[PDB]
Write an enzyme that holds these catalytic residues in place. Structure first.
Site, short mmCIF file in Angstrom:
data_model
loop_
_atom_site.label_atom_id
_atom_site.label_comp_id
_atom_site.label_asym_id
_atom_site.label_seq_id
_atom_site.Cartn_x
_atom_site.Cartn_y
_atom_site.Cartn_z
N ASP A 20 0.84 -1.20 0.00
CA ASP A 20 0.00 0.00 0.00
C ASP A 20 0.89 1.26 0.00
O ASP A 20 0.90 2.07 0.93
CB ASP A 20 -1.02 -0.06 1.15
CG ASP A 20 -1.99 1.14 1.15
OD1 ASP A 20 -2.76 1.27 0.20
OD2 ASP A 20 -1.95 1.93 2.09
N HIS A 64 2.63 3.56 -3.36
CA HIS A 64 3.04 3.89 -4.73
C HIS A 64 4.47 4.44 -4.69
O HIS A 64 5.42 3.81 -5.16
CB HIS A 64 2.03 4.89 -5.31
CG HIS A 64 2.46 5.36 -6.69
ND1 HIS A 64 2.31 4.63 -7.81
CD2 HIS A 64 3.08 6.58 -7.02
CE1 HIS A 64 2.82 5.39 -8.80
NE2 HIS A 64 3.29 6.56 -8.36
#
Length: 137
Positions: free
Chosen positions: A14, A16
């Site tokens: 979780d 980027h």
């Protein structure tokens, strides 16, 4: 150690690269040897940047409210890794959002993590933190 290497990994999934794209750039810019372990990364890899470089400090980047859930006892895992002397930073969504400092730093420091940054921290704190800690500033 010759130089101060900080090693920052974004821990667990979780993630980027949010607040770990220019938030890394800040530290690299800070005149630090800053090894970007990669977004989504295991602690045995952060340890591995400390084996590689000679980390004085090892940072985890939490973007998922589960900073502690993996990270707890990387100071001791670093300790365990034959990399004892390293003081750790833990920053971001260290707990679910973020709880409350008295309890949270009791958590982190009990494992060994010396310093706790909130979620959405200026890197000026973290930079001033590593400076002040490592005999600078």
């Amino acid at each position: 150690m010759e130089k101060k290497t900080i090693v920052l990994g974004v821990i667990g999934s979780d993630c980027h690269a949010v607040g770990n794209k220019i938030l890394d750039h800040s530290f690299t810019n800070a005149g630090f040897n800053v090894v970007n372990i990669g977004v989504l990364s295991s602690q045995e890899d952060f340890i591995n940047a400390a084996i590689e470089t000679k980390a004085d400090l090892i940072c985890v980047s939490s973007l998922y409210g589960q900073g502690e859930i993996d990270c707890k006892g990387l100071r001791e895992k670093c300790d365990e890794a034959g990399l004892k002397g390293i003081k750790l930073f833990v920053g971001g969504n260290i707990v679910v959002g973020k709880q409350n400092w008295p309890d949270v730093e009791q958590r982190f420091k009990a494992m060994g993590f010396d310093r706790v940054y909130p979620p959405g921290t200026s890197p000026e704190t973290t930079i001033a933190d590593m400076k002040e800690v490592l005999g600078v500033e």
